[PDB]
């Protein structure tokens, strides 16, 4: 599923997001555009052979399972196929895993590159949250 920016907001919202370890709605929207432009759907595999997987691009080597990554831990004990869900509600709960872990936000290249540092309330203006 292709999201709506205030769509997900609202998603993302409703999922215990906003402010989650001190990072605004905003951050969670933008980090989303940049990782997969809100496509549910998107893969992209690395060098090192493991994949990104959804609308936040989750990790194979440490995240989850996709049969295919040796050495993967599976830290969000799920499957990667899971986190390309038109619910969302898998990809949050390992997210919030994700960002608890020690360099929050960093985690995500995007995140890094073009949304820390930037007017990100941007992302959820004129949303009716």
């Given at each position: ?11 993302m919202?409703?999922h ?16 989303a555009?940049?990782?997969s432009?809100?496509?549910s ?12 997987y959804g609308i936040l691009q989750i ?17 969000c ?5 899971a986190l390309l869900s038109?619910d969302i509600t898998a990809s949050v709960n390992c997210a ?34």
């Amino acid at each position: 599923k292709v999201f709506g920016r205030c769509e997900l907001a609202a998603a993302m919202k409703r999922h215990g997001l906003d402010n989650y370890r001190g990072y605004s709605l905003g951050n969670w929207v933008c980090a989303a555009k940049f990782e997969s432009n809100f496509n549910s759907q998107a893969t992209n595999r690395n060098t090192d052979g493991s994949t990104d997987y959804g609308i936040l691009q989750i990790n194979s080597r440490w995240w989850c399972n996709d049969g295919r990554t040796p050495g993967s831990r599976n830290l969000c004990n799920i499957p990667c196929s899971a986190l390309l869900s038109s619910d969302i509600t898998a990809s949050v709960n390992c997210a919030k895993k994700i960002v608890s872990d020690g360099n929050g936000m960093n985690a995500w290249v995007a995140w890094r590159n073009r949304c820390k540092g930037t007017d990100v309330q941007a992302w959820i203006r004129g949303c009716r949250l």
